[PDB]
Amino acid sequence: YRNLPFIPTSAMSYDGAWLEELIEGYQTLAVEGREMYSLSFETQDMQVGGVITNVKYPPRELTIKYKLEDRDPRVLQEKFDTLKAFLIRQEDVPIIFNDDLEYTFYGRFKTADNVAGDTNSIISSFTVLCSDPFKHGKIQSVKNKVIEVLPYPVKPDKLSFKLLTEGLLATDGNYRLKSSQAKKGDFLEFDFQTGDTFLNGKVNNNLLDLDSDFKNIRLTTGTDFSSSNYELTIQYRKAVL
Amino acid sequence: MTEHFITLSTTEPNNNIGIVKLRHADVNSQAIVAQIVENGQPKNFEGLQPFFCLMAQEATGQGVSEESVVSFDAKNGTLKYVASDNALQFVGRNEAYFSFRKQEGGRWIEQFSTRTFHYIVEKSIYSQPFKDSNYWWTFKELYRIFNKYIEDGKKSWEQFVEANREILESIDPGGVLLAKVIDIEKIVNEKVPAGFKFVLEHDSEYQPEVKVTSYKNAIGTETDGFDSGPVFGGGTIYNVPVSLSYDRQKVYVEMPKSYTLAGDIILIDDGTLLVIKETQVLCFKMSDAKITKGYVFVA
Amino acid sequence: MTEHFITLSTTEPNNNIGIVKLRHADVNSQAIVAQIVENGQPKNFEGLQPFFCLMAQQGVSEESVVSFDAKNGTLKYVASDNALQFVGRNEAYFSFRKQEGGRWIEQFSTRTFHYIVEKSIYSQPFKDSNYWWTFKELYRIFNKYIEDGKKSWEQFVEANREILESIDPGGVLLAKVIDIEKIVNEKVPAGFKFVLEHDSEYQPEVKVTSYKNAIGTETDGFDSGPVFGGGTIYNVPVSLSYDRQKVYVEMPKSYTLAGDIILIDDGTLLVIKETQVLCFKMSDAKITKGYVFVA
Amino acid sequence: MTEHFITLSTTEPNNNIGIVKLRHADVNSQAIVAQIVENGQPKNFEGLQPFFCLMAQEATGQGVSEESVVSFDAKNGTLKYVASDNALQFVGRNEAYFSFRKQEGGRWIEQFSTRTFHYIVEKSIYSQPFKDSNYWWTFKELYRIFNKYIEDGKKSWEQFVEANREILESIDPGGVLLAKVIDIEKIVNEKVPAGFKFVLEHDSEYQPEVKVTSYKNAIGTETDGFDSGPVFGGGTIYNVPVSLSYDRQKVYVEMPKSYTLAGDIILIDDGTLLVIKETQVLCFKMSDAKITKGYVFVA
C-alpha cells in the first residue's frame, strides 16, 4: 500500500510548505476570517446624525482549525514540537490557501487556543495575524498606465522611469512626483516602493527625489501617467480584501 | 499570443502553489514561460531535454502525458512551452510539472524534475456538449460528419455521372456519336460567340473596344434586398467571349447563346451599359467612346 | 493476446464506457471486441465493412477491419502500429462502408470513443522490492567461486582428454617430460651450485651472466671470433642461499662450468673454460674465494 | 543534478529538518547532502562505509534498502547519497536512516547509526513495477544447480576414467617415467612459486616490491630459549622465489610449496612482516610502502 499525505480543500501553505505534509496526522479543517472583512470607524456625533472623522483598515487575523492525531503519546508531543518550531516566526511569512491559490497573504503566527492533554487525537485552532489585511495576486509589469480592473487602490512595488526631456514631473491628476535637476538624456530611475530609490545602477537616496515629491502614490483602475517626457514601467500586485 | 510566467523550484516544497489557467479552444497561443530555480539560484539543465509532464485526471497510465519543450535556454534555466491540442484536451483540474532528462538511447541516465503546479483548463463553446436533433453533440463531431457528407456526396455524384455515361457511351457503337454531339453543342452554346447579338450605338467615328462580363447577385440586384444573396457584392464574374462587328457609330457584339438575357437596359453616364433581369446582370464596357443607345439585334 | 470487450452506440455519446488501456511496444496482439448498437439494440451491417478511423493528434488514418460478424454486430479490431502511435488519450470511431464505383462510401458510423495508449518503458528484469548490499555481494562471491572453480576443473578435464583420449598417450607423455626436462635444465636454478666467500657480514646481491667468445678468450687469439667483444650475454637465473661470509649461488644444468677461477681486484669473479665465460658480479662486498660446492 | 541539504544527528531526533521531497521517476538526479552531527559536533566516520538504510512498511514488509554510499567526506562528516530506484519505490512518506560500518572478511567490527528521518516521494507520470524479493530462492537455486554439477560431474568423470582404464594401465611400464617425474616435481616445489599464496595489504596505490627470505633459529625463536640453537643469530638464509600479483592495496605473493608455513603473523610497524612457526621464520620485506595486514590466501 502507499502512505500518501492528504491535502484538504482549504489547506494552508505557511512559508511555501504545507503543514499537513510536514507533520503526519495534521489536517486543516477550516479557515475563518478571509471571506469577510470589518472596518474601523472614527465618528464625531452631533445633534442630528454624526459625521465620519476617519476610516481605518484594521490588521486581520485568520483563525485556522486543525486536527493532529497519533497513536503514540511520545511521538504526538514531538509532532507538536515540530509544529510550534515551524509556526513561531520572527518575521512575516507568505500564506497561500488550497482553495484560493491565486492570492498570497503575508502574516505571522499569533496565538493558539487551549489544547487538551488526553485522547491522542486533538482538535484545536490557532490564529495567524496579518499585518497587511490585503491578499496580493501575481506581480505585473505594465507600461505607463494601469487599465486592469483594480478592486482596491494599490500601492506599487517598483516604478522604472526613463527620461527623454530636461526634468521629471510624473502626474496622474491627483499625485505629482517631482525631480528637479534630474539625469536628462535617457537615464533610468528606479523607485522601489518596498525599500529605497536608485539612479541608473547605483543607490541614490539623498538626491533622487525633490522635497515636494510623492512616495505614497496609489493606483486606481484608471490611473494614467503616460507622457512624452518619460517612459514609465509600473510594477504592482493586485490587492484584495 | 498570451504568456504565463512561473518561477518553478526543485528544492522548495511547494507541491500545489503556483497557478496556471487556460481554456479548451486556444490553439498555439497560450504559452508557459518558466524559470527553473534550485536552492535560490537558477538551474542549468545543459545537456538535458526539457519535457512537459501532465498528470491528467481519468487518463492515467505509464505515459500519462509527456511533450518535449522546443523553446528553451539551458544556460539561464528558462523555457517556453506552448500548450498543444493534447494539453488542452483534458478539461478540468489537472497537475503538471517539467522533467529534464539526459537520455542516451532507450535507457535514461539523469532525470530531474520541478515541483508540481496546478494546470487547470476551463471549458469552451467547442468542449461543451450541445443538444442538436434530440441528440447530444460536440462541434468537432458534427464538423467531421458534415465534411464526410460533402466528400462522400461528391464521390457518389462523380460516379453517378460516370456510370450513366458508359451506359449510353461505351455500350453503343453509334451512342458515342450522340454523347459527343451534346458536349460539342454545349461548348458552342457557352464558349463560342453564337446565338446572341447586341447593338451598341456610339459617338465615335472609329471602332471602340467592347468588353463583356456576366455576373449574378450583384450590388442591389438580389431577390430579398441588399446583402440577401449568398455572395455579397456579386457572385462569379464570367468574361463573355465576344465577336465584334462594326458599322458607322454602331457596334454589333456577338455572344454565346447561353449569355442570352432579355431584361432592362440601363445606360450609365460614360462608356458603360447594363442589361439586368432580376439577379442576372450583363455588363458592357466600352473604351474611347460614349454609348448613346443599346438594344438586342433584330432582323 | 489481451482482449477488451465493450459496447458502442450510434445515438448516445460514448464516454460512460469502460476505460481501455493499451500497451505501446506490446509483444501480444491487443484486440478490441465491440457490440454495435442502434438505439440500444444490435445493428446488422450485412454487406458493409467496418473501418477503424483515427483522429489527428496530424494523424488521420483509415483501417479496414478483417474480423467481423455482420449478422450479430460483433467486430474484432487488432491494435496496429498506427493505432498505437501516440502515447495518451486517443479518439477513434468505427465507420461502415460499401464500395460502389471503385470507392468506399459511408452509410452509417458509430460515435467517437476514447482509448488510452500506455507506454512500455521499464525492462522485463524488474528490480526486487527489497535490496540488500550484503546479499548481493554474498551472491557475487559465491558465484565467482563456483564459476572460477568450474573453469579450473574444466581446464583439467580438457587437458587430460588432449593427451589420453586424443593422439597416443605413450609418445606424448615422453615428449613433454623431455620438454619440461629441457626447460628446468636451462631456466630453473637447481643443477649447478657455486660458493662465493666474502668480507661482508650481511647478504650481498649476486648477479650471474653467461657469455661466449669474450675479450681475450677466443680460440685463435684476440679478435678471432665471429662477434668482437663477446657473443650473446645471458642473464643466469639464480636461487641464492646465505651463511656467514658465504653465498651459495645455484644455477641451471645448462650453465654448469668447471674451468679456471679468476678473481679480479674488486667485487667480480670469473669461471673460464676455453671460450665460455661465467661471470659473478657482487654488490656492496668483495669476493675473497670462489669454488664449486662439494659436500 | 538536484541537491537536498540536510543535517542529521545520531544523538538527537531529526524532526526539525525541512521537508525532503523527491519525485518518483528521477533515476540519478536526487542527491541528499547530509551533515552528520554527534552531540552537536560533526562526526568523523573515518574507516566506516556509509550506508543508506530504508525501512520497509510494517503492513506488507516490503521495501527494504541497504545501499553503499559512493560520495562522502569522512573527515568533516558529510555525505552525498543519490536516490535510487529502490529509494523512490513507494509514493508517499518513507522512513530511512544512515549506517556506518567497518568490515573485515565478513564480520562487522563497529557500526553506528543516525537517527531516523522522513522523506516524501512525489507521484510521477511513470510508475516503476517492482518484483517480489527472491534472495533466498536465488541462493538456493544457485546452490542446487552447483550441487547438480557435483553429482553429474562425478558420474561423467567416473565413466571417463573407467572407459580409458586399459590405456591408463599401459601408459607407463613399471615406472621409468613416474620415477623421473617425481624427481622433477621436487624442483618445482622448491625453486619456483607453485602452491603457497600470501596476501599483503598496503597503504600504497601502486605496486610495491616485496622480497621474501626463509631462515631457522633466529633470535627469540629457538626451542630451548635464547642462544640454545646450533648457529647463533640464525641458520641458512634462503632467498624465496616469488611471483607477485597486484590488486588495489593488495599484493599476492606466490611462493613454492616447500615454503608453506602456517604460523603466527607478526607485523612490525613499517615495511616488514614475519610468519613465525616455532623455529622457522618467513620474512616479508616491502619497499616504498607500509604493510597494514598480512594473511594466507583463501578462496
Side-chain angles (χ1 to χ4, degrees), chain B residues 147-175:
Chain B
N147 279 243
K148 197 75 186 180
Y149 288 148
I150 301 158
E151 186 191 304
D152 296 336
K154 72 174 74 175
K155 278 169 89 182
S156 294
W157 180 257
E158 274 176 323
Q159 141 60 214
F160 170 70
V161 70
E162 198 184 301
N164 282 36
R165 222 84 200 269
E166 271 70 72
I167 296 166
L168 187 87
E169 168 148 323
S170 125
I171 308 169
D172 291 304

PDB file of all heavy atoms in Angstrom, chain B residues 147-175:
ATOM      1  N   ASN B 147     -18.494  17.285 -43.155  1.00  0.00           N
ATOM      2  CA  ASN B 147     -17.428  17.244 -44.149  1.00  0.00           C
ATOM      3  C   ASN B 147     -17.359  15.897 -44.841  1.00  0.00           C
ATOM      4  O   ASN B 147     -16.941  15.837 -45.993  1.00  0.00           O
ATOM      5  CB  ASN B 147     -16.082  17.634 -43.535  1.00  0.00           C
ATOM      6  CG  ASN B 147     -15.876  19.127 -43.404  1.00  0.00           C
ATOM      7  OD1 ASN B 147     -14.968  19.698 -44.011  1.00  0.00           O
ATOM      8  ND2 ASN B 147     -16.657  19.780 -42.555  1.00  0.00           N
ATOM      9  N   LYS B 148     -17.825  14.835 -44.151  1.00  0.00           N
ATOM     10  CA  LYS B 148     -17.899  13.476 -44.668  1.00  0.00           C
ATOM     11  C   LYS B 148     -19.054  13.378 -45.663  1.00  0.00           C
ATOM     12  O   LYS B 148     -18.919  12.708 -46.686  1.00  0.00           O
ATOM     13  CB  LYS B 148     -18.090  12.462 -43.537  1.00  0.00           C
ATOM     14  CG  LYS B 148     -17.777  11.013 -43.942  1.00  0.00           C
ATOM     15  CD  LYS B 148     -16.262  10.742 -44.055  1.00  0.00           C
ATOM     16  CE  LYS B 148     -15.888   9.386 -44.595  1.00  0.00           C
ATOM     17  NZ  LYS B 148     -14.412   9.234 -44.651  1.00  0.00           N
ATOM     18  N   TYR B 149     -20.179  14.063 -45.382  1.00  0.00           N
ATOM     19  CA  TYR B 149     -21.311  14.104 -46.299  1.00  0.00           C
ATOM     20  C   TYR B 149     -20.923  14.805 -47.589  1.00  0.00           C
ATOM     21  O   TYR B 149     -21.319  14.344 -48.652  1.00  0.00           O
ATOM     22  CB  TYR B 149     -22.502  14.815 -45.660  1.00  0.00           C
ATOM     23  CG  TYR B 149     -23.231  14.058 -44.568  1.00  0.00           C
ATOM     24  CD1 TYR B 149     -23.826  14.722 -43.506  1.00  0.00           C
ATOM     25  CD2 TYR B 149     -23.384  12.672 -44.636  1.00  0.00           C
ATOM     26  CE1 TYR B 149     -24.557  14.044 -42.535  1.00  0.00           C
ATOM     27  CE2 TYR B 149     -24.109  11.979 -43.664  1.00  0.00           C
ATOM     28  CZ  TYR B 149     -24.685  12.670 -42.611  1.00  0.00           C
ATOM     29  OH  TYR B 149     -25.381  12.015 -41.624  1.00  0.00           O
ATOM     30  N   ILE B 150     -20.100  15.873 -47.498  1.00  0.00           N
ATOM     31  CA  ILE B 150     -19.608  16.621 -48.660  1.00  0.00           C
ATOM     32  C   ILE B 150     -18.641  15.761 -49.514  1.00  0.00           C
ATOM     33  O   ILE B 150     -18.821  15.667 -50.730  1.00  0.00           O
ATOM     34  CB  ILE B 150     -19.009  18.006 -48.277  1.00  0.00           C
ATOM     35  CG1 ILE B 150     -20.054  18.874 -47.560  1.00  0.00           C
ATOM     36  CG2 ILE B 150     -18.476  18.753 -49.517  1.00  0.00           C
ATOM     37  CD1 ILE B 150     -19.469  19.985 -46.688  1.00  0.00           C
ATOM     38  N   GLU B 151     -17.639  15.134 -48.875  1.00  0.00           N
ATOM     39  CA  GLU B 151     -16.628  14.284 -49.503  1.00  0.00           C
ATOM     40  C   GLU B 151     -17.263  13.075 -50.179  1.00  0.00           C
ATOM     41  O   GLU B 151     -16.901  12.777 -51.307  1.00  0.00           O
ATOM     42  CB  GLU B 151     -15.628  13.830 -48.425  1.00  0.00           C
ATOM     43  CG  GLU B 151     -14.396  13.050 -48.881  1.00  0.00           C
ATOM     44  CD  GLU B 151     -13.613  12.413 -47.734  1.00  0.00           C
ATOM     45  OE1 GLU B 151     -13.200  13.140 -46.803  1.00  0.00           O
ATOM     46  OE2 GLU B 151     -13.377  11.185 -47.784  1.00  0.00           O
ATOM     47  N   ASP B 152     -18.165  12.353 -49.479  1.00  0.00           N
ATOM     48  CA  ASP B 152     -18.802  11.124 -49.984  1.00  0.00           C
ATOM     49  C   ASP B 152     -19.907  11.410 -50.969  1.00  0.00           C
ATOM     50  O   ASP B 152     -20.151  10.603 -51.870  1.00  0.00           O
ATOM     51  CB  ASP B 152     -19.318  10.223 -48.844  1.00  0.00           C
ATOM     52  CG  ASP B 152     -18.238   9.643 -47.913  1.00  0.00           C
ATOM     53  OD1 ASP B 152     -17.058   9.530 -48.347  1.00  0.00           O
ATOM     54  OD2 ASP B 152     -18.581   9.251 -46.776  1.00  0.00           O
ATOM     55  N   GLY B 153     -20.550  12.561 -50.796  1.00  0.00           N
ATOM     56  CA  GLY B 153     -21.603  13.030 -51.690  1.00  0.00           C
ATOM     57  C   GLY B 153     -21.074  13.313 -53.082  1.00  0.00           C
ATOM     58  O   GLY B 153     -21.681  12.882 -54.062  1.00  0.00           O
ATOM     59  N   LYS B 154     -19.907  13.999 -53.162  1.00  0.00           N
ATOM     60  CA  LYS B 154     -19.231  14.355 -54.418  1.00  0.00           C
ATOM     61  C   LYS B 154     -18.643  13.163 -55.147  1.00  0.00           C
ATOM     62  O   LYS B 154     -18.707  13.097 -56.375  1.00  0.00           O
ATOM     63  CB  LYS B 154     -18.222  15.519 -54.258  1.00  0.00           C
ATOM     64  CG  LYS B 154     -16.911  15.223 -53.514  1.00  0.00           C
ATOM     65  CD  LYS B 154     -15.938  16.431 -53.547  1.00  0.00           C
ATOM     66  CE  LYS B 154     -16.324  17.578 -52.629  1.00  0.00           C
ATOM     67  NZ  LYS B 154     -15.295  18.653 -52.614  1.00  0.00           N
ATOM     68  N   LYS B 155     -18.125  12.205 -54.384  1.00  0.00           N
ATOM     69  CA  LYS B 155     -17.596  10.969 -54.926  1.00  0.00           C
ATOM     70  C   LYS B 155     -18.748  10.149 -55.508  1.00  0.00           C
ATOM     71  O   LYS B 155     -18.589   9.537 -56.571  1.00  0.00           O
ATOM     72  CB  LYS B 155     -16.870  10.186 -53.835  1.00  0.00           C
ATOM     73  CG  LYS B 155     -15.442  10.672 -53.597  1.00  0.00           C
ATOM     74  CD  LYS B 155     -14.834  10.068 -52.321  1.00  0.00           C
ATOM     75  CE  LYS B 155     -14.137   8.751 -52.592  1.00  0.00           C
ATOM     76  NZ  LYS B 155     -13.583   8.134 -51.360  1.00  0.00           N
ATOM     77  N   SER B 156     -19.918  10.182 -54.824  1.00  0.00           N
ATOM     78  CA  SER B 156     -21.140   9.478 -55.221  1.00  0.00           C
ATOM     79  C   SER B 156     -21.763  10.088 -56.489  1.00  0.00           C
ATOM     80  O   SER B 156     -22.335   9.360 -57.304  1.00  0.00           O
ATOM     81  CB  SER B 156     -22.162   9.462 -54.079  1.00  0.00           C
ATOM     82  OG  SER B 156     -21.786   8.721 -52.928  1.00  0.00           O
ATOM     83  N   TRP B 157     -21.624  11.410 -56.663  1.00  0.00           N
ATOM     84  CA  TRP B 157     -22.153  12.109 -57.829  1.00  0.00           C
ATOM     85  C   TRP B 157     -21.236  11.926 -59.017  1.00  0.00           C
ATOM     86  O   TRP B 157     -21.721  11.787 -60.139  1.00  0.00           O
ATOM     87  CB  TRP B 157     -22.342  13.597 -57.540  1.00  0.00           C
ATOM     88  CG  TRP B 157     -22.887  14.360 -58.711  1.00  0.00           C
ATOM     89  CD1 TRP B 157     -22.188  15.173 -59.553  1.00  0.00           C
ATOM     90  CD2 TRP B 157     -24.225  14.300 -59.228  1.00  0.00           C
ATOM     91  NE1 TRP B 157     -23.022  15.668 -60.530  1.00  0.00           N
ATOM     92  CE2 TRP B 157     -24.279  15.144 -60.355  1.00  0.00           C
ATOM     93  CE3 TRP B 157     -25.398  13.651 -58.822  1.00  0.00           C
ATOM     94  CZ2 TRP B 157     -25.454  15.337 -61.093  1.00  0.00           C
ATOM     95  CZ3 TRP B 157     -26.571  13.872 -59.539  1.00  0.00           C
ATOM     96  CH2 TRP B 157     -26.584  14.688 -60.672  1.00  0.00           C
ATOM     97  N   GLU B 158     -19.910  11.959 -58.772  1.00  0.00           N
ATOM     98  CA  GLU B 158     -18.873  11.773 -59.790  1.00  0.00           C
ATOM     99  C   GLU B 158     -19.018  10.405 -60.432  1.00  0.00           C
ATOM    100  O   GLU B 158     -18.957  10.303 -61.660  1.00  0.00           O
ATOM    101  CB  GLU B 158     -17.484  11.922 -59.168  1.00  0.00           C
ATOM    102  CG  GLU B 158     -16.991  13.360 -59.111  1.00  0.00           C
ATOM    103  CD  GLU B 158     -15.655  13.548 -58.420  1.00  0.00           C
ATOM    104  OE1 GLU B 158     -15.364  12.849 -57.420  1.00  0.00           O
ATOM    105  OE2 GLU B 158     -14.888  14.414 -58.895  1.00  0.00           O
ATOM    106  N   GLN B 159     -19.265   9.387 -59.603  1.00  0.00           N
ATOM    107  CA  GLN B 159     -19.526   8.036 -60.034  1.00  0.00           C
ATOM    108  C   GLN B 159     -20.942   7.959 -60.699  1.00  0.00           C
ATOM    109  O   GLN B 159     -21.072   7.294 -61.714  1.00  0.00           O
ATOM    110  CB  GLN B 159     -19.258   7.042 -58.887  1.00  0.00           C
ATOM    111  CG  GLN B 159     -20.240   5.862 -58.774  1.00  0.00           C
ATOM    112  CD  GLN B 159     -20.345   4.925 -59.949  1.00  0.00           C
ATOM    113  OE1 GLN B 159     -21.424   4.398 -60.218  1.00  0.00           O
ATOM    114  NE2 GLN B 159     -19.258   4.708 -60.678  1.00  0.00           N
ATOM    115  N   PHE B 160     -21.992   8.622 -60.148  1.00  0.00           N
ATOM    116  CA  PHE B 160     -23.293   8.587 -60.824  1.00  0.00           C
ATOM    117  C   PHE B 160     -23.236   9.028 -62.284  1.00  0.00           C
ATOM    118  O   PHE B 160     -23.843   8.393 -63.133  1.00  0.00           O
ATOM    119  CB  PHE B 160     -24.320   9.432 -60.073  1.00  0.00           C
ATOM    120  CG  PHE B 160     -25.637   9.672 -60.783  1.00  0.00           C
ATOM    121  CD1 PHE B 160     -26.536   8.656 -60.973  1.00  0.00           C
ATOM    122  CD2 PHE B 160     -25.966  10.912 -61.253  1.00  0.00           C
ATOM    123  CE1 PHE B 160     -27.751   8.884 -61.589  1.00  0.00           C
ATOM    124  CE2 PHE B 160     -27.187  11.139 -61.850  1.00  0.00           C
ATOM    125  CZ  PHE B 160     -28.072  10.125 -62.021  1.00  0.00           C
ATOM    126  N   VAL B 161     -22.554  10.141 -62.554  1.00  0.00           N
ATOM    127  CA  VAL B 161     -22.448  10.652 -63.902  1.00  0.00           C
ATOM    128  C   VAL B 161     -21.594   9.737 -64.790  1.00  0.00           C
ATOM    129  O   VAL B 161     -22.012   9.404 -65.900  1.00  0.00           O
ATOM    130  CB  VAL B 161     -22.042  12.154 -63.909  1.00  0.00           C
ATOM    131  CG1 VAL B 161     -20.600  12.397 -63.467  1.00  0.00           C
ATOM    132  CG2 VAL B 161     -22.342  12.817 -65.237  1.00  0.00           C
ATOM    133  N   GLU B 162     -20.450   9.262 -64.254  1.00  0.00           N
ATOM    134  CA  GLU B 162     -19.512   8.388 -64.947  1.00  0.00           C
ATOM    135  C   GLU B 162     -20.151   7.075 -65.346  1.00  0.00           C
ATOM    136  O   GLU B 162     -20.023   6.665 -66.496  1.00  0.00           O
ATOM    137  CB  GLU B 162     -18.263   8.154 -64.099  1.00  0.00           C
ATOM    138  CG  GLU B 162     -17.073   7.637 -64.892  1.00  0.00           C
ATOM    139  CD  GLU B 162     -15.870   7.318 -64.025  1.00  0.00           C
ATOM    140  OE1 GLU B 162     -15.380   8.234 -63.325  1.00  0.00           O
ATOM    141  OE2 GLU B 162     -15.390   6.161 -64.076  1.00  0.00           O
ATOM    142  N   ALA B 163     -20.876   6.441 -64.421  1.00  0.00           N
ATOM    143  CA  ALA B 163     -21.548   5.163 -64.696  1.00  0.00           C
ATOM    144  C   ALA B 163     -22.647   5.294 -65.741  1.00  0.00           C
ATOM    145  O   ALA B 163     -22.739   4.449 -66.640  1.00  0.00           O
ATOM    146  CB  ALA B 163     -22.105   4.552 -63.418  1.00  0.00           C
ATOM    147  N   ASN B 164     -23.440   6.384 -65.644  1.00  0.00           N
ATOM    148  CA  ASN B 164     -24.529   6.702 -66.563  1.00  0.00           C
ATOM    149  C   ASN B 164     -24.036   7.126 -67.922  1.00  0.00           C
ATOM    150  O   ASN B 164     -24.781   7.065 -68.897  1.00  0.00           O
ATOM    151  CB  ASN B 164     -25.408   7.757 -65.956  1.00  0.00           C
ATOM    152  CG  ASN B 164     -26.330   7.176 -64.925  1.00  0.00           C
ATOM    153  OD1 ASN B 164     -25.982   6.257 -64.173  1.00  0.00           O
ATOM    154  ND2 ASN B 164     -27.543   7.685 -64.886  1.00  0.00           N
ATOM    155  N   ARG B 165     -22.769   7.521 -67.991  1.00  0.00           N
ATOM    156  CA  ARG B 165     -22.124   7.899 -69.231  1.00  0.00           C
ATOM    157  C   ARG B 165     -21.812   6.635 -70.011  1.00  0.00           C
ATOM    158  O   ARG B 165     -22.199   6.556 -71.168  1.00  0.00           O
ATOM    159  CB  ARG B 165     -20.837   8.702 -68.958  1.00  0.00           C
ATOM    160  CG  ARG B 165     -20.632   9.895 -69.875  1.00  0.00           C
ATOM    161  CD  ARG B 165     -21.371  11.139 -69.402  1.00  0.00           C
ATOM    162  NE  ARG B 165     -21.559  12.088 -70.498  1.00  0.00           N
ATOM    163  CZ  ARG B 165     -20.710  13.060 -70.815  1.00  0.00           C
ATOM    164  NH1 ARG B 165     -19.596  13.237 -70.111  1.00  0.00           N
ATOM    165  NH2 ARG B 165     -20.968  13.865 -71.834  1.00  0.00           N
ATOM    166  N   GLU B 166     -21.167   5.635 -69.368  1.00  0.00           N
ATOM    167  CA  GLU B 166     -20.778   4.377 -70.014  1.00  0.00           C
ATOM    168  C   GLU B 166     -21.913   3.475 -70.498  1.00  0.00           C
ATOM    169  O   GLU B 166     -21.678   2.607 -71.339  1.00  0.00           O
ATOM    170  CB  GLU B 166     -19.704   3.620 -69.219  1.00  0.00           C
ATOM    171  CG  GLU B 166     -18.281   4.021 -69.614  1.00  0.00           C
ATOM    172  CD  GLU B 166     -17.844   5.422 -69.210  1.00  0.00           C
ATOM    173  OE1 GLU B 166     -17.613   5.653 -68.003  1.00  0.00           O
ATOM    174  OE2 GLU B 166     -17.696   6.282 -70.109  1.00  0.00           O
ATOM    175  N   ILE B 167     -23.145   3.731 -70.025  1.00  0.00           N
ATOM    176  CA  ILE B 167     -24.342   3.013 -70.459  1.00  0.00           C
ATOM    177  C   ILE B 167     -24.677   3.429 -71.920  1.00  0.00           C
ATOM    178  O   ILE B 167     -24.776   2.580 -72.811  1.00  0.00           O
ATOM    179  CB  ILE B 167     -25.510   3.225 -69.445  1.00  0.00           C
ATOM    180  CG1 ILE B 167     -25.159   2.625 -68.071  1.00  0.00           C
ATOM    181  CG2 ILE B 167     -26.819   2.626 -69.969  1.00  0.00           C
ATOM    182  CD1 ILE B 167     -26.042   3.040 -66.922  1.00  0.00           C
ATOM    183  N   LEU B 168     -24.771   4.732 -72.155  1.00  0.00           N
ATOM    184  CA  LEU B 168     -25.045   5.297 -73.465  1.00  0.00           C
ATOM    185  C   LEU B 168     -23.772   5.306 -74.340  1.00  0.00           C
ATOM    186  O   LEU B 168     -23.826   4.965 -75.520  1.00  0.00           O
ATOM    187  CB  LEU B 168     -25.550   6.731 -73.258  1.00  0.00           C
ATOM    188  CG  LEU B 168     -26.057   7.509 -74.465  1.00  0.00           C
ATOM    189  CD1 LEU B 168     -27.526   7.230 -74.709  1.00  0.00           C
ATOM    190  CD2 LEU B 168     -25.803   9.000 -74.281  1.00  0.00           C
ATOM    191  N   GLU B 169     -22.644   5.702 -73.746  1.00  0.00           N
ATOM    192  CA  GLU B 169     -21.364   5.901 -74.400  1.00  0.00           C
ATOM    193  C   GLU B 169     -20.570   4.706 -74.911  1.00  0.00           C
ATOM    194  O   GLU B 169     -20.192   4.674 -76.070  1.00  0.00           O
ATOM    195  CB  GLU B 169     -20.473   6.814 -73.525  1.00  0.00           C
ATOM    196  CG  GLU B 169     -19.004   6.925 -73.879  1.00  0.00           C
ATOM    197  CD  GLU B 169     -18.373   8.274 -73.569  1.00  0.00           C
ATOM    198  OE1 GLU B 169     -19.056   9.307 -73.743  1.00  0.00           O
ATOM    199  OE2 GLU B 169     -17.177   8.305 -73.202  1.00  0.00           O
ATOM    200  N   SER B 170     -20.315   3.732 -74.040  1.00  0.00           N
ATOM    201  CA  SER B 170     -19.492   2.592 -74.397  1.00  0.00           C
ATOM    202  C   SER B 170     -20.317   1.420 -74.947  1.00  0.00           C
ATOM    203  O   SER B 170     -19.909   0.785 -75.924  1.00  0.00           O
ATOM    204  CB  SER B 170     -18.547   2.188 -73.256  1.00  0.00           C
ATOM    205  OG  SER B 170     -18.618   0.833 -72.831  1.00  0.00           O
ATOM    206  N   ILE B 171     -21.498   1.166 -74.348  1.00  0.00           N
ATOM    207  CA  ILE B 171     -22.372   0.048 -74.715  1.00  0.00           C
ATOM    208  C   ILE B 171     -23.019   0.233 -76.107  1.00  0.00           C
ATOM    209  O   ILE B 171     -23.638  -0.705 -76.626  1.00  0.00           O
ATOM    210  CB  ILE B 171     -23.356  -0.322 -73.552  1.00  0.00           C
ATOM    211  CG1 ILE B 171     -22.569  -0.530 -72.208  1.00  0.00           C
ATOM    212  CG2 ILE B 171     -24.202  -1.565 -73.872  1.00  0.00           C
ATOM    213  CD1 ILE B 171     -23.428  -0.662 -70.832  1.00  0.00           C
ATOM    214  N   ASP B 172     -22.768   1.388 -76.769  1.00  0.00           N
ATOM    215  CA  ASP B 172     -23.282   1.625 -78.117  1.00  0.00           C
ATOM    216  C   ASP B 172     -22.227   2.050 -79.167  1.00  0.00           C
ATOM    217  O   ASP B 172     -21.432   2.944 -78.872  1.00  0.00           O
ATOM    218  CB  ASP B 172     -24.483   2.582 -78.101  1.00  0.00           C
ATOM    219  CG  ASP B 172     -25.727   1.980 -77.478  1.00  0.00           C
ATOM    220  OD1 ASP B 172     -26.163   0.911 -77.938  1.00  0.00           O
ATOM    221  OD2 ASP B 172     -26.226   2.544 -76.488  1.00  0.00           O
ATOM    222  N   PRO B 173     -22.228   1.428 -80.394  1.00  0.00           N
ATOM    223  CA  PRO B 173     -21.281   1.836 -81.473  1.00  0.00           C
ATOM    224  C   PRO B 173     -21.568   3.234 -82.073  1.00  0.00           C
ATOM    225  O   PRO B 173     -20.642   3.949 -82.466  1.00  0.00           O
ATOM    226  CB  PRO B 173     -21.442   0.731 -82.538  1.00  0.00           C
ATOM    227  CG  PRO B 173     -22.294  -0.346 -81.886  1.00  0.00           C
ATOM    228  CD  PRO B 173     -23.114   0.339 -80.852  1.00  0.00           C
ATOM    229  N   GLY B 174     -22.856   3.590 -82.136  1.00  0.00           N
ATOM    230  CA  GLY B 174     -23.360   4.897 -82.546  1.00  0.00           C
ATOM    231  C   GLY B 174     -23.818   5.786 -81.383  1.00  0.00           C
ATOM    232  O   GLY B 174     -24.199   6.933 -81.590  1.00  0.00           O
ATOM    233  N   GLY B 175     -23.780   5.286 -80.148  1.00  0.00           N
ATOM    234  CA  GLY B 175     -24.161   6.061 -78.966  1.00  0.00           C
ATOM    235  C   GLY B 175     -23.102   7.068 -78.537  1.00  0.00           C
ATOM    236  O   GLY B 175     -23.417   8.057 -77.869  1.00  0.00           O
TER     237      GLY B 175
END
